[PDB]
Write a protein that binds this ligand. Sequence first.
Ligand code: CLF
Ligand code: SF4
Ligand code: CA
Ligand code: NA
Lengths: 522, 476, 286, 289
Amino acid sequence: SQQVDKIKASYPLFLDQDYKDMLAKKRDGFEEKYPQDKIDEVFQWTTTKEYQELNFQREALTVNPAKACQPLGAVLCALGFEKTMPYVHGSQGCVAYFRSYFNRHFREPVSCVSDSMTEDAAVFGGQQNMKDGLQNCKATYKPDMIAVSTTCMAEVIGDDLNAFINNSKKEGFIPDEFPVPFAHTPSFVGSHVTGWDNMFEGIARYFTLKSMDDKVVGSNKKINIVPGFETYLGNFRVIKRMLSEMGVGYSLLSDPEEVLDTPADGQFRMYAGGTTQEEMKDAPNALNTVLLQPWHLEKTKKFVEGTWKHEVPKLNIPMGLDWTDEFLMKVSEISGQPIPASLTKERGRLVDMMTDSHTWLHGKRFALWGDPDFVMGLVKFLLELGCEPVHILCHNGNKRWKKAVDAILAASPYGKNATVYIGKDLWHLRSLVFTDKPDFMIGNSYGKFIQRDTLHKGKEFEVPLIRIGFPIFDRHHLHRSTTLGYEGAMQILTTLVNSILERLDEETRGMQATDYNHDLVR
Amino acid sequence: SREEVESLIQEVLEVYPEKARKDRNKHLAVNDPAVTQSKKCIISNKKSQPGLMTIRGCAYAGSKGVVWGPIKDMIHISHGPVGCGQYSRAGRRNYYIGTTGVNAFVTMNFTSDFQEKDIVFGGDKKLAKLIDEVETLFPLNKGISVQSECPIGLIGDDIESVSKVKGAELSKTIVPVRCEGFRGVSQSLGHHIANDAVRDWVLGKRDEDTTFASTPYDVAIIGDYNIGGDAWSSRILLEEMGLRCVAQWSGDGSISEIELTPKVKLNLVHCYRSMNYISRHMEEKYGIPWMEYNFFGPTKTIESLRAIAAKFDESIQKKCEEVIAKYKPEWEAVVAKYRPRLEGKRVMLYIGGLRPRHVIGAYEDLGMEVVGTGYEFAHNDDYDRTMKEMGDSTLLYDDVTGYEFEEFVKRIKPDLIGSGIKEKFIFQKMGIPFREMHSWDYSGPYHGFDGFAIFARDMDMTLNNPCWKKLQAPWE
Amino acid sequence: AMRQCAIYGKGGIGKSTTTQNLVAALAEMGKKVMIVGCDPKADSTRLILHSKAQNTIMEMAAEAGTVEDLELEDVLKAGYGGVKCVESGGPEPGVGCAGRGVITAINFLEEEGAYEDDLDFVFYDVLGDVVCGGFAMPIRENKAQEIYIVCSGEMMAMYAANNISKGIVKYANSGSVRLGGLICNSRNTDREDELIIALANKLGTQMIHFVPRDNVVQRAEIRRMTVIEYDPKAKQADEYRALARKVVDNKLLVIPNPITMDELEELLMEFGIMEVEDESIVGKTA
Amino acid sequence: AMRQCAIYGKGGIGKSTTTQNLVAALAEMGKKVMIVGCDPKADSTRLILHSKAQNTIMEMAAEAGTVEDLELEDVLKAGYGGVKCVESGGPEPGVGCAGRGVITAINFLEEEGAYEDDLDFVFYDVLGDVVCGGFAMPIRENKAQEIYIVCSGEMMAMYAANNISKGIVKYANSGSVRLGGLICNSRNTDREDELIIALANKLGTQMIHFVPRDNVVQRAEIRRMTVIEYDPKAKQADEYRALARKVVDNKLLVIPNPITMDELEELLMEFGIMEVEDESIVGKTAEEV
Ligand code: CLF
Ligand code: SF4
Ligand SMILES: [Ca+2]
Ligand code: NA
């Protein structure tokens, strides 16, 4: 039943007595459900060290991964180029998923096409799909560029992108001069960030490989900036703001900030902003190229260093105090521009915030996950804050990356209780937060299920989730945030200390029980 | 004006190259309520043309995400690379009651996470080892399903053998499902492939078991995935009517309820598209008749309750009228409050395989008019059931393209659009109220009488929201 | 610095022997080298290691949960002159794509840090009988920039050389992979050197070196070693040193011009390897 | 019904001339046979069609964007004794897979009804140089049920025979594929027949026939034909007839037992073809010993 002036949605509608009795009868009569005491027994066992050991010896099963597949990253990279349509050669199901995934995180339209290869292409390849696809796409959506990537079906059967595109042009399906950069992006190799790297290097080689004799390093006086897989709008923005603030000429290669944030003014803009084709062609003429997330830009780095001849600086992602300082100093060194008073002051303001909140942050224990660069940047800042990064999980991380992170940790006493895990998933992380309970978890929305699980053991075992990463689907507009530079450090610091204070307020809200410590001032 | 619509269609088609133009023209039509054989007006269930931005998904989505995913006490393995299972993890709101990670597993993502070496050597040994690991870490699971992703069939793995061997070894029900994404042309074949997998590996388990005490009022809810609780708000009415719901396929469903379904007296089909396959099979094999029903809006719900009750004795028919009288003042109050706020508004819909026609009655119960509707993957028997539900000269579109949908909306100018997540943000930017009609925009349930109140509240809050009057800067 | 080279060629003509003696010669003159075997037979490093068979990455990978479970240490072995050796190995017979098995192995070396900043050279010993998309993957994936083809004055070996050049041409318009020359492994055929130089000319490349037949090679091999290590004074040793030097100083990297079957037969006939065809009898009896 | 056989063997040992001479022998014998060429480097129909090179499916399929445009008579040609010939077309150098090139042929033949029961024998002539998923497609797709391996009394040829046997074993427990025997193409080597016989015994099979080296074979080849057609009275002609008869009546179809590399080397060493390694001297320079 419903009271017209107080309509109830699923929650709490199903809590009504009649629904509750109905669900009890459904269970008892037809679910042949395990007895509740048996369910409690197994649940308890899943929080033990014995279960954790069995959990960590898994070799074939993966549960609740913390990574996605290559083409997702190829699509995001493509989205950052002017009037460019991401095109994934292969099965269409993949494209419905890539769009939906980004639509829920950005709460914005996400355009991408597929050439719908089906069963009859599984035997003889998708050459025809590519011919008709490129023609239909260009005609219908009028992009000035089509960036091609692939689904696993096309990779497994061996479709040759290069040849398929050449033939489409040779036969007149699309103009011969129409730009169609491409990249093979197998989902069974690496992860979504690898797809970003592959797609980027593909677009970079398309516009510069054959014309390198025309280039002169440093002739355009700019510094190229390659962002990598980035899902926080404030990150593209803060980099451009700091560089402009320094008077540094630059070129952001793959800039999706405009297309991922169009205004709701009466018209839908399929395309907006982005790196221009001219900027890619001119890129080799820059003084140098800076990679913001080097751990997933290795193929790009080889091409930029080996072909463009740029002395790519060995810089970590600009997250936290030290690394933002290093990034600015290196940029200052390469461009000849001094770091201005405004940035020096912003730095000092972040330090002020650190001195003001250090007492609540000191010794706080965290479990965290995400992409390699983001994770190490978070780890470095936590150390700078006097916090302890206990469980560091990067499902798509690698051995060389782990060694680098272990070195960062060894350089600080606050890194003594930390363990870096690669190849492990969120089911592995769930065991860790039960066996070696931290104070909070810093991760994406999938972490909410872990918080729910720990609360079930008991309120005193609950590990609250602090949402930073990708994807974030259960909160609105956090994709507008910043995690890079002094601005991102200030935001993260504020979020961490207030998460601590919110939980403390919750634990001291008990009238005449724990409210003796429900301080008005903290 | 029929002429104006026919003209709109031709104008829109002009942007296409020859091949795509001739093909798309067969998937667009102006409705004629008199037609009974939809093929005379529109074709469907054909492949999508490359590069046109179809809104369709794949067979894996139709099998794993739709049919199997919801079975709560079974563990479903997204077999292949990491992609598929991650994008589909908890994206569909098929509600259930359970202790997740212990006796229920719906929101989790189990996968074999194929790496390059798995493509080279095949994943059958990995699958076998994975199964032992699942058994060790999730001992309360009551069955396992293997949802094949694209590479499985392409590399020649034999998941059927693995399932048979491990199944006998562990005395466990292990279902191999060949729902690789390259099969079929949309989510549809996934449904059919999934229904056949239930039939062949699960449904006959209790064919020789007579321990289930049946009653003459035993029914099963076929084809309701309990989105936002839809099935529970449907189940409550059927039982208040005196019937006994033995099973729910597959929202909040258990493997035991499924195995018990062959003992029911009547299969109640809501989603015809996804489960007519297994319904026909149960009639053929067990003699169980099945009927279609609609629980969207008071008119359709009352009509459905009455039609279902007529299938049983007079005592059920009496209880049916008592149930209708109990809720009458509730939905009349909903209509009284919201119809005056929605009277006359026009809606354009675009969904999957049932709702595009199933929700029309609910909109009309609020005085609204559906001026356009279409399906991503419906077949012609679906359009046959659609034309008579839509008004004369309304627009119909099968596997509509992004371009087409946008152009039709700009011309028709609906007051509200009901579609999916990939469509939502496009139209909001155009200043057109939008409601998700797959996920209910995180609201719901929409089925039954309790669901109708929510649906009304939702159409009203969005269509009449103050935000829609603010898209134009006043200095413009 | 580090140059990525691939030795492609038909099987059964001493290609692996020539590859290992070329590498031993480079190590001898001071270069840092790594040998990555990409032949399903996995016999590209025995002479450097004095071994009967090196455990392959594919063999070990099949036994493990994930390839990262493997340790470079069991995969990479130091042999003569410090040159590092690895064998990709192939998937079981009849099942996998040998080519994808090779890429899996190379990707592993990359992640594991096997490519030290020290390395001067990396030589991939790849099979070139049937030049399918699989065996052509090291090219398609820019794993090697310099391709050197080992062949001999016979039909099939030369036919293989033309196919490899075709593979290269396939990806040339979108990558930097190029043909650095032919290496003729002498079979002692009459005017063999002339015939390969002629082929090189038509292909638009060069015959970087003529490796004569010498039984010192077999006396070295029965001891599981290269000539360079077994008998550095041997005249054949100097033959490999000259090949090494010429590769080191090589600057001729081109996109070849594969010839037609006709062109190939005309060439084989011009040197007696093949004879003119009397098409008057074609289809006769008694 | 129909016997679907396949001839596997490394390249360069005359496997294709033996396949075609075999098939011609079955034809003059009265058997309806079709040859499906699956070799990139050894045209398997040249001697049956007197042609210089037969147009391939892959090749002619480029001439129409797709195979759904080709015509059975453009592909399937008939020659001596009425045996029908078709060449799959090797993988396009650098991008194709030999395994998909075969699957291409099979489907086109099956749908044009050129794969009906009017045929007594079908023989897939496939390269055994590398036994990968691609080249084992006729075995994987359960089209080749009787495998005959052409080999020679030397290392590579025997190593390949063992390789193919390993592929046969991988699918033997999934389908009906079996090894029918070893066919030794003589190299005029001393004790060659005994060596291949020993190899067959170890593999669990048999050496169905020893094909002698005979110049009439080459005289026939330059005239683009089989010896069965060129000189049916030649001694070599009866060699092919005997091999043909044995295949027709063959009843020994087994799941082979591949050997280890050590066993293969011991065999060759036992026959004096491979020099025995002095271990005490391994890794020692000429100057040291
Ligand atoms: S049609 Fe195929 S079954 Fe359907 S959703 Fe696509 S994959 Fe999967 Fe793809 S998202 Fe990535 S590229 Fe493969 S792993 Fe998966
Ligand atoms: S691509 Fe080559 S190596 Fe790979 S399966 Fe095909 S024929 Fe074999
Ligand atoms: Ca938005
Ligand atoms: Na237990």
